[PDB]
Design a binder for this molecule. Sequence first.
Ligand code: CLA
Ligand code: CLA
Ligand code: CLA
Ligand code: CLA
Ligand code: CLA
Ligand code: CLA
Ligand code: CLA
Ligand code: 32N
Lengths: 241, 241
Amino acid sequence: PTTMLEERDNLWEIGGPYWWPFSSFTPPAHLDGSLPGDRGFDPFSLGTSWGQPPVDVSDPNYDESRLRWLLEGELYNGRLAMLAVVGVLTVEAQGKGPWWEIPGNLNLFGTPYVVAVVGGHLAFALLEKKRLENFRETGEAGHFGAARFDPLDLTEANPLGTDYNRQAEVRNCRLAMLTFLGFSVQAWVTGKGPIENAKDHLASPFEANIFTYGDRGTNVVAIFSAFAAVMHIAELAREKK
Amino acid sequence: PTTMLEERDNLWEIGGPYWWPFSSFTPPAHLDGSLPGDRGFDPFSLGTSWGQPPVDVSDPNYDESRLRWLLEGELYNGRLAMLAVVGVLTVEAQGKGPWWEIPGNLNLFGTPYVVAVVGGHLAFALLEKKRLENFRETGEAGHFGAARFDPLDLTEANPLGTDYNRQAEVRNCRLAMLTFLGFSVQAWVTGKGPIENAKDHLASPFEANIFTYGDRGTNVVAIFSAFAAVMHIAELAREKK
Ligand code: CLA
Ligand code: CLA
Ligand code: CLA
Ligand code: CLA
Ligand code: CLA
Ligand code: CLA
Ligand code: CLA
Ligand SMILES: CC1=C[C@@H](O)CC(C)(C)[C@H]1/C=C/C(C)=C/C=C/C(C)=C/C=C/C=C(C)/C=C/C=C(/C=C/C1=C(C)C[C@H](O)CC1(C)C)CO
């Protein structure tokens, strides 16, 4: 595949070339630097379980095919979030009201709904069939009728390195996913929009924060703090095998 | 590097050439006199953990590179505090009000804020890239476009010794850091300014002290006394391996 790296390197980010930037840390055995965006992040070992790739079973190098399937899933989920962020910023910040009420103001019912759903699913099923059918011969799955989709050959055309685009794409998509999670959770606690929250925070950043919106802003903090205290205990327990 | 010493010596200060000036004290194994400002101060052994230097991994002398990275961090943090102390004394003691309200009286909002932030970050990212890129070939990181930055060669031009400037710089920076911590905590308990506290203490030094400002002056003393009683018990426990 061309979705895998060519140099097997770890980039030096905020603290080190690994999350958890202390000296008592050994990266997980199945993460060795072969895929873009590697940092050894796996507190719950979901890379050795959690999925079944569409490959012939009992073929050697099957445990690696599962990480490639999960990477395909990660890229696919990020490529939609990067489009959704642009599509919500270019609408909510141009003329329109809350972005979470636009679909409910189309008045789609009866026959048009049915024909739209059926046609969209026909197209997506035809594309998905080809994706599944591509992954199985070559360990890669391009979305638009081709296994690789490089209409303009730019996968190695960046003047700062060979495998630079591959590392940039998996990181922009990774940032956009939790960007959109932020939009979805912000719209439910504050009631305002994205820009209307940034400006409120920049105006006076000591009452226009999360801790001043009532019970929801406390419930989210509680959930976040409880989930963040479990994946660190899990990592500490993992380091003792 | 030229940030390390040439003579491997310990200077004799307030009590001895070590903190904890008693006879039952052996310096930590990783602190041996090779860096400026050495005193064997390490109750919590943060010099063998806590960080990952940007060097090629598995290269010999990796445990020493981490102390050099932490020394780089110490010098970097001190060089900003020494500028901030001068910048707050030359403003608060010249004409202006509380120094912790100046940024809030610039009225920076909208486009100017965004362009200023983006430009500053562009410049700092360009400089930081060069710093990270310098540390990795030579174990040193100068901030201003050069690995060493000696426009006027004065690193060995002091008429009291060879490595005198190196020991003076790490100590002035070390004093300025807790100087500024004092300014920040003083402004929150007293409400006055820096000079307005020194003059109040010199006027009548038995009611213009920390113990007479209410509950905050007691909370700070309590926190200080609780943190000071933990790093001595830790040192005593360390001395018994
Ligand atoms: C409350 C829980 C919690 C906390 C406190 C942290 C804290 C941290 N995480 Mg995170 N993390 C958490 C939950 C949490 N994590 C969860 C739930 C997940 C699952 C998704 C992760 C997954 C995760 C990963 C995968 C990584 C981290 C990393 C980090 C570090 C960088 C954070 C960062 O970029 O800040 C944002 C900060 C900035 C963009 C710049 C900071 C500058 C600000 C604006 C002010 C100046 C800086 C500051 C003053 C300097 C120190 C001063 C201070 C000591 C007084 C940091 C120690 C990274 C790390 O440690 O890499 C080595 C990392 O790779 N975390
Ligand atoms: C759905 C998106 C998705 C998927 C499929 C993956 C998949 C992968 N990531 Mg992860 N990752 C993602 C999003 C995703 N990532 C995001 C958004 C971040 C930013 C925090 C990261 C950051 C990250 C790092 C730093 C690293 C990986 C790595 C990996 C690989 C490790 C194996 C693994 O855990 O796979 C299984 C993963 C799943 C099956 C997804 C499980 C989703 C859970 C169950 C839902 C949790 C939802 C909850 C609301 C989260 C709240 C977070 C918020 C509070 C902060 C794998 C290819 C490692 C690697 O080597 O990559 C090449 C690696 O070093 N990822
Ligand atoms: C997947 C994300 C997503 C989703 C679900 C929607 C959904 C919607 N958008 Mg769209 N939109 C998106 C992304 C998205 N948008 C993007 C990326 C942009 C920036 C160009 C916009 C800009 C935009 C505007 C300006 C408006 C909408 C509006 C709408 C609504 C009516 C449909 C319409 O007029 O579309 C029009 C959308 C477009 C002309 C751009 C579509 C871009 C597609 C989805 C990106 C993917 C293209 C694909 C990969 C190309 C394949 C090429 C290959 C075969 C070679 C609808 C709820 C209208 C609205 O808000 O009504 C109230 C409206 O005025 N959108
Ligand atoms: C993706 C990045 C992102 C950004 C830039 C912001 C920005 C903001 N959020 Mg947060 N937010 C995010 C994700 C993000 N959010 C996520 C993932 C969640 C779900 C847990 C929320 C849920 C949330 C709520 C419920 C509220 C905010 C609010 C705010 C504002 C005040 C800060 C605060 O209270 O943070 C709180 C942050 C958290 C609870 C969790 C940390 C969020 C991520 C993981 C930190 C990422 C750090 C990273 C270095 C930032 C990059 C910035 C980017 C420009 C490069 C501010 C505009 C408040 C607001 O609107 O005030 C007006 C508010 O009420 N956010
Ligand atoms: C409440 C807790 C506490 C106390 C009582 C002390 C006490 C001491 N520390 Mg400190 N220390 C503490 C917490 C504390 N430390 C903490 C939290 C840290 C972490 C940052 C350290 C880290 C630390 C280090 C790294 C070092 C010390 C050192 C010292 C000694 C010198 C202090 C000094 O310069 O005073 C200031 C005094 C003067 C500048 C001059 C004194 C003159 C005054 C004005 C009056 C006259 C002197 C006096 C009357 C003479 C004795 C008389 C008396 C017996 C009646 C002293 C025994 C040093 C040491 O022992 O070196 C051998 C040393 O190197 N400490
Ligand atoms: C951020 C600044 C900073 C940093 C990075 C370092 C780094 C270092 N110092 Mg330390 N040092 C500092 C400030 C700093 N120092 C200050 C301000 C003082 C004066 C009290 C000293 C005094 C001192 C001595 C006397 C010695 C060192 C030495 C060392 C080395 C020991 C290894 C170590 O612990 O590193 C790791 C350190 C860190 C990761 C910083 C941790 C910061 C903690 C977690 C925060 C505590 C904040 C809290 C509010 C403090 C309140 C104090 C107040 C109540 C008095 C290392 C290079 C030894 C050496 O050989 O130097 C060459 C040595 O002998 N330092
Ligand atoms: C890092 C510390 C720091 C910070 C954050 C600030 C911040 C500020 N200062 Mg400045 N200031 C500083 C240090 C600092 N100062 C120093 C060191 C001095 C002594 C010369 C002053 C003296 C000073 C005065 C007299 C005034 C301010 C004022 C201000 C405010 C408006 C900006 C301005 O007019 O700057 C003007 C600042 C300068 C002309 C001096 C800047 C010195 C820089 C920061 C030192 C570093 C230089 C750099 C290393 C050189 C690189 C060379 C290399 C390429 C070869 C602003 C909040 C104004 C104010 O209070 O308005 C209400 C104001 O009147 N400052
Ligand atoms: C927890 C854990 C354990 C470890 O072992 C490893 C690990 C990495 C798994 C780790 C963490 C995993 C994490 C944090 C994963 C997070 C995944 C996340 C947050 C994924 C988010 C995906 C979001 C997506 C697709 C969003 C799609 C949004 C769309 C929106 C569509 C819109 C709608 C509805 C109408 C609007 O008018 C217009 C528009 C906004 C476009 C649709 O266009």
